[PDB]
Amino acid sequence: GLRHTFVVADATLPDCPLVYASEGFYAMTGYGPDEVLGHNCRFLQGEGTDPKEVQKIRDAIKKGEACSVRLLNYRKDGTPFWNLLTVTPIKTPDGRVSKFVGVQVDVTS
Ligand SMILES: *[C@@]12=NC3=[C]C([C])=C([C])[C]=C3N([C][C]([O])[C]([O])[C]([O])[C]OP([O])([O])=O)C1=NC(=O)[N]C2=O
Secondary structure, three states, X not given: OOOOEEEEXXXXXXXXXXXEEOHHHHHHHOOOHHHOOOXXXXXXXXXXXXXXXXXXXXXXXXXOOOEEEEEEEEOOOOOEEEEEEEEEEEEOOOOOEEEEEEEEEEOOO
């Protein structure tokens, strides 16, 4: 299938730090687990990351709904790429949000 990357953020902590990233996520962005694990996914954003689309993620997280956005992310080396971002809330049986999963597709074409 199409190439994609996959990360998991812990929603129990207030700022959703990532706790697991697929091997491709490190290889696509250029960051390593020592620079990724325990940080919010915001370190990928830069000068051209549309602030309106970022708000959609922030809001859908606070409300606990899924959302899908198109952001401008930046590799470790500074070069940019276009990130199709889909976030999904994983709930416990008591309706509470426990984890947030992300699927990032480099859609620079
Ligand atoms: C990021 N992927 C990503 C994956 C998950 C599971 C979640 C919950 C969020 C992201 N983000 C967004 C980031 O963590 C944050 O929520 C946003 O910056 C909005 O909040 P702020 O505080 O900044 O207003 C992802 N952002 C990216 O840029 N790239 C991803 O791959």
